[PDB]
Design a protein that fits this description.
The complex is a heterotrimer of chains A (about 550), B (about 550) and C (about 55). With about 550 residues, chain A is mainly α. Chain A contains 19 helices and eight strands. In chain A, strand 6, helix 18 (about 510-515) and strand 7 (about 530) form a beta-alpha-beta unit. Chain B is built from 22 helices and nine strands. Chain B has three domains: about 1-165 and about 290-310, Up-down Bundle (ABC transporter transmembrane region fold), CATH 1.20.1560.10; about 175-265; about 320-560, 3-Layer(aba) Sandwich (Rossmann fold), CATH 3.40.50. In chain B, helix 8 (about 165-200) packs antiparallel against helix 10 (about 210-260). Helices cover about 60% and strands about 0% of the residues of chain C. Classes of the chains: A mainly alpha (about 550), B alpha/beta (about 550), C mainly alpha (about 55). The interface between A and B is large, with 88 and 91 residues. Chain B: This is Antigen peptide transporter 1. Chain B: GO terms for molecular function: ABC-type peptide antigen transporter activity; ADP binding; ATP binding; ATP hydrolysis activity; metal ion binding; MHC class I protein binding; MHC class Ib protein binding; peptide antigen binding. Chain B: Belongs to the ABC transporter superfamily. ABCB family. MHC peptide exporter (TC 3.A.1.209) subfamily. Chain B: It catalyses: a peptide antigen(in) + ATP + H2O = a peptide antigen(out) + ADP + phosphate + H(+).
Chain lengths: ~550, ~550, ~55
């Protein structure tokens, strides 16, 4: 726990190293803003010192002029550091989103089933911005205090050494209290979390067994047991508030205790020592803050570890990269057009003890047309995903032209292998972007000819801005037929070797596919026809009759 | 509003005692500037010890006493607010259980979890924090504006405040206009982030994942270019808000300086005026931040109030005859479209009833009717010559027993779970005999520390058979007349099914215990006394299995197919 | 918005010897951050539905 949070902090700061220079400028403007603010009492004292004795117009004018200038410069310097610190928050927040988004895309699809859409957003939106807020907020408060404390103690030491040691020696008395108060507080908060957790668990079990509680009918006991847990929980809030109010009293008494004991000697410093008239008023104005700034300094050191636990839940995504095979790229010099499955065993990564597909041994598919017969929930899409290499096979081997699918390149497999799904994948991009989805340099004539071959060209022609028509997110503007025809236009735009069809021809037009799957275009490779069309099943040569995760 | 205030107030007196205690302390809180003024004017003119010390002693006594009055007052406030927090949380929890089952059945858990604990906690937490500070600084404001009279000085300060809070909000509006664009452009990037990832396998199928990161990088750089203007705007706003402070402070030096030159009001009185004016502005500055949060909080409060505002016949002689006189069981959603319709039931003492039929053919509704959770829509459903509503909840709990379909188990120990729902505490011999009779004694004696073993969440430790056996012992421990079981032993073992069947049929207590349950096991029905062939609510036939087999009806078809 | 950083500056500008102190200032960020945590997830679709839909 303690080492983990330290190492995770040491990991956190390392991410900010590219934005070092601006933090040094922010440090310089902060030091300037503090050292400016500490100079405002010094002159204001000297104005009161000079003024009582004589009008002294040049001294009076100059002292006010410089004081008023330094205040203006301090106010300016206090702004620009804020402008730097708020800009620093943009750096880490925009950086972490890019790293998080890029890291998630590399992760396996099995995790996506486990992960919740609401949580993944919540961490991406809030939990990042907390982590980006962390370092500037911690650095600003720490650095502003550190410089101001040693500043004030310096500006005290310039005035006198006699009244400083007694005021300094009291700080251990305050620092010792905060260490007890914080250790008391954090334990009570963690106790309250556990108390509220037990009180909540009763509501969770009650909500879980509503019918049980209503059938037997002893609600009064459930309310009484909830009230019993609420009573002991209520005591923890009372202890916290009583301990805090007591600390307010102790601090309020101790503040004036040091102030009175100081000021009394401060009066003697005029009579006996002959220190200075205005310097007493300055030293008081300095003192007033000195203690109050230590309160932040003692708290921030201990408090630093609390916000680290928030980052851990983001870093949990970044931690692990275990899935998939080694990224080695076999390049297809010529289109082999040979799909195979040697003694395959398809099981889901989400749950190991479930029998999905076992002993899928056949292969030998190249010429003519291939068909994949099977009932509802037989696992035809699982075989298509196994052929396309979405999920890794639990047993056997998915060979392609006497070579492993994992050993194939990802771009080469995406280029060579294809799989026309039933439901059309929609995106926010334009018709050209959707038509050239995952294309490095798609040809304009190729995209238009692919759409014309796919039979969406009449729809694309009438559409506003033609090929640059903005597609509505989740398929808003385009119809079901256009959504299906778009997938045909994608397949035509690819012009890939292998091209499976998972229930695509049922919704879309029948005449469109055959022309693409005949002649020179058909020679790219065979097609795994997984669909309900018996006419397509009759026309095809090969017919894999699947049954109960086994070849009939 | 009126209901909000009327419900929340504690005593007529504890809060009144607190309010009087705050005022008397508040004068002691703001006593310091008068003593500071006296301390300053002493240095300029006077040189007496007694007057100076007397001032410091009164200063110290008032400041120390005020701290004690605050320490007590805050204690009484937090003690009273604790009672209100506990009372409101106690009242709101009961209001859930008071409402009918239709809301629980129709609506999901997430609503009834989040609306109860989180909303009531975060409301009362906000109210406790806000109302404390609201009533504190108002008394400070009124008392300091009071002592400020002891006319021209008050006329000055009244005119200044508006100018203090004019420029920050006026310039801050133009600052805020840019923020909504950053929020929208951020939400846009997150929208595209979720939209791109949501359909993962379509991205994974192709090699688009590399390309999308560039589109993400562009959408981020479009924010990055805008952020430069937002970052400097914060610094510009910081200057305008800060400079107004020096404009105010210098104005006081010039306006006060003329009064010092004229020599009407003294330097000490000027120091008090400056201290009170500086304290007043900083006090009021916090007071303005609550009024939005009250409007934010009260919006939830009215919905919590909207959520909240929605003849015990005793046990003595067990008659044991249930008459569904032309009954009609219908759900709360659809009044006309009933689950059970034209019910003509007629139970009796010492007779195993049965209700054979299809999936959702008034099976659960009939059992729920007999238990009397949801009342009958039409006709009548008397038990022992009297309506179920007439019986006392505890008495009906004792008389009627019903094992549910989903074998639920609480988080407590096996003794607590076995003896759940009872006024008097169950004896160890009773708990042991119930577990022995029901057939859970092997499960109870087999586990660690007997009945003291804590049951895990969602039935983790206990199995399906152990949960069903525990549910059987839970019902058996009461020793009730009516015995219900809708889909109880669905995934029951050979050893379990035989035990439940023996307890149902072979057991001596069955003579004084009616058993009307939706039988999963056919043999349990085949070896019963009374039966009914349900069909969309209405009973088609009602007799013996041999009679139904001989006549050839629903039971014959159900037995055959 | 970067609201949190404004609140710290407001506190560090006017310290005094008040009742709230920096201990509260962090709790305001914890409270407001948890509100954003609640608001973010509830904005789009539904939290119960995972990323991948089909079993």
């Amino acid at each position: 726990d303690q080492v983990n949070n330290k190492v995770l902090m040491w990991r956190l700061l390392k991410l900010s190293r590219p934005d070092l220079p601006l933090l040094v400028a922010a440090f310089f403007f902060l030091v300037l803003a503090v050292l400016g603010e500490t100079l405002i009492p010094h002159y204001s004292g000297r104005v009161i010192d000079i003024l009582g004795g004589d009008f002294d117009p040049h001294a009076f004018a100059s002292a006010i002029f410089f004081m008023c200038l330094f205040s203006f410069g301090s106010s300016l310097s206090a702004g620009c550091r804020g402008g730097c610190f708020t800009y620093t928050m943009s750096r880490i927040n925009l950086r972490i989103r890019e790293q998080l988004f890029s890291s998630l895309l590399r992760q396996d699809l099995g995790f996506f089933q486990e992960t919740k859409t609401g949580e993944l957003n919540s961490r991406l939106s809030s939990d990042t911005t907390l982590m980006s807020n962390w370092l500037p907020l911690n650095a600003n408060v720490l650095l502003r205090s550190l410089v101001k404390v040693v500043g004030l103690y310096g500006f005290m030491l310039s005035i006198s050494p006699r009244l400083t040691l007694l005021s300094l020696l009291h700080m251990p008395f305050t620092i010792a209290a905060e260490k007890v108060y914080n250790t008391r507080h954090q334990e009570v908060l963690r106790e309250i979390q556990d108390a509220v957790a037990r009180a909540g668990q009763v509501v969770r079990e009650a909500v879980g067994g509503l019918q049980t509680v209503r059938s037997f009918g002893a609600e009064e006991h459930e309310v009484c047991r909830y009230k019993e847990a609420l009573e002991q929980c209520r005591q923890l809030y009372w202890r916290r508030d009583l301990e805090r109010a007591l600390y307010l009293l102790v601090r309020r008494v101790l503040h004036l205790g040091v102030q009175m004991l100081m000021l009394s000697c401060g009066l003697q410093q005029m009579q006996d020592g002959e220190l200075t008239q205005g310097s007493l008023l300055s030293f008081m104005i300095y003192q007033e803050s000195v203690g109050s700034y230590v309160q932040t300094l003692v708290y921030i050191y201990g408090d630093m570890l609390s916000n680290v636990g928030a980052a851990e839940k983001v870093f949990s995504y970044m931690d692990r990269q275990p899935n998939l095979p080694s990224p080695g790229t076999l390049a297809p010099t010529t289109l082999q057009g040979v799909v195979k499955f040697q003694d395959v065993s398809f099981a889901y990564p989400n749950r190991p003890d479930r029998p999905v597909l076992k002993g899928l041994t056949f292969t030998l598919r190249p010429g003519e047309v291939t068909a994949l017969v099977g009932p509802n929930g037989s696992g035809k899409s699982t075989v298509a995903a196994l052929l396309q290499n979405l999920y890794q096979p639990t047993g056997g081997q998915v060979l392609l032209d006497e070579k492993p699918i994992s050993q194939y390149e990802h771009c080469y497999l995406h280029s060579q292998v294809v799989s026309v799904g039933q439901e059309p994948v929609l995106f926010s991009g334009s018709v050209r972007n959707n038509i050239a989805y995952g294309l490095q340099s798609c040809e304009d004539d190729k995209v238009m000819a692919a759409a014309q071959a796919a039979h969406a060209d009449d729809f694309i022609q009438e559409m506003e801005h033609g090929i640059y028509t903005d597609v509505g997110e989740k398929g808003s503007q385009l119809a079901a037929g256009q959504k299906q025809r778009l997938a045909i236009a994608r397949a035509l735009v690819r012009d890939p070797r292998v091209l499976i069809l998972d229930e695509a021809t049922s919704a879309l037009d029948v005449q469109c596919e055959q022309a693409l799957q005949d002649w020179n275009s058909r020679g790219d490779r065979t097609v795994l026809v997984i669909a309900h069309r018996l006419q397509t099943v009759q026309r095809a040569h090969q017919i894999l009759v699947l049954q109960e995760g086994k070849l009939q | 509003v009126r209901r909000l205030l009327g419900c929340l107030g504690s005593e007529t007196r504890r809060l009144s005692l607190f309010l009087v205690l705050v005022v008397l302390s508040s004068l002691g809180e703001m006593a310091i500037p008068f003593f500071t003024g006296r301390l300053t004017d002493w240095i300029l003119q006077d040189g007496s010890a007694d007057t100076f010390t007397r001032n410091l002693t009164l200063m110290s006594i008032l400041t120390i006493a005020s701290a004690v009055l605050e320490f007590v007052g805050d204690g009484i406030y937090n003690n009273t607010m604790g009672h209100v927090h506990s009372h409101l949380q106690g009242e709101v929890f009961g209001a859930v259980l008071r409402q009918e089952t239709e809301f629980f059945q129709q609506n999901q858990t997430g609503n009834i979890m989040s609306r109860v604990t989180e909303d009531t906690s975060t409301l009362s937490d906000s109210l406790s924090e806000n109302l404390s500070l609201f009533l504190w600084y108002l008394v400070r404001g009124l008392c300091l504006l009071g002592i400020m009279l002891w006319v021209s000085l008050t006329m000055v300060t009244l005119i200044t405040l508006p100018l203090l809070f004019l420029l920050p909000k006026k310039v801050g509006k133009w600052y805020q206009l840019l923020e909504v664009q950053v929020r929208e452009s951020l939400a846009k990037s997150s929208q595209v982030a979720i939209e791109a990832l949501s359909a993962m396998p379509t991205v994974r199928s192709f090699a688009n994942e590399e390309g999308e990161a560039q589109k993400f990088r562009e959408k981020l750089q479009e924010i990055k270019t805008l952020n430069q203007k937002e970052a400097v705007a914060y610094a510009v706003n910081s200057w305008t808000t800060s400079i107004s402070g020096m404009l105010l402070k210098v104005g006081i030096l010039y306006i006060g300086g003329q009064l010092v030159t004229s020599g009407a009001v003294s330097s000490g009185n000027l120091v008090t005026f400056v201290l009170y004016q500086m304290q007043f502005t900083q006090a009021v500055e916090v007071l303005l931040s609550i009024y939005p949060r009250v409007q934010k909080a009260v919006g939830s409060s009215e919905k919590i109030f909207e959520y909240l505002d929605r003849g015990l016949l005793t046990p003595l002689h067990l008659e044991g005859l249930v008459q569904f006189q032309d009954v009609s069981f219908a759900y709360p959603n659809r009044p006309d479209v009933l689950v059970l319709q034209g019910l003509t039931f007629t139970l009796r003492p010492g007779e195993v009833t049965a209700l054979v039929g299809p999936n959702g053919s008034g099976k659960s509704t009939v059992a729920a009717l007999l238990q009397n959770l949801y009342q009958p829509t039409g006709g009548q459903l008397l038990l022992d010559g009297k309506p179920l509503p007439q019986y006392e909840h505890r008495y009906l709990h004792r008389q009627v027993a019903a094992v549910g379909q989903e074998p639920q188990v609480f988080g407590r120990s096996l003794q607590e779970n076995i003896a759940y729902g009872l006024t008097q505490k169950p004896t160890m011999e009773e708990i042991t005999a119930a577990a022995v009779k029901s057939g859970a004694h092997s499960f109870i004696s087999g586990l660690p520390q007997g009945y003291d073993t804590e049951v895990d969440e969602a039935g983790s430790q206990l199995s399906g058979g152990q949960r069903q056996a525990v549910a059987l012992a839970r019902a058996l421990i009461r020793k009730p007349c009516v015995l219900i079981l809708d889909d109880a032993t669905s995934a029951l073992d050979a050893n379990s099914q035989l035990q439940v069947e023996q307890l149902l049929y072979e057991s001596p207590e069955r003579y004084s215990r009616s058993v009307l349950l939706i039988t999963q096991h056919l043999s349990l029905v085949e070896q019963a006394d009374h039966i009914l062939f349900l069909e969309g609510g209405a009973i088609r036939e009602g007799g013996t299995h041999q009679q139904l087999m001989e006549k050839k009806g629903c039971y014959w078809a159900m037995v055959q197919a | 918005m970067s609201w949190a950083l404004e609140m710290a500056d407001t506190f560090l500008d006017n310290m005094r010897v008040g009742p709230r102190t920096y201990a509260d200032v962090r709790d305001e960020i914890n409270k407001r951050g948890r509100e954003d945590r609640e608001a973010a997830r509830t904005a789009v679709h539904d939290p119960e539905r995972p990323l991948l839909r089909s079993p």
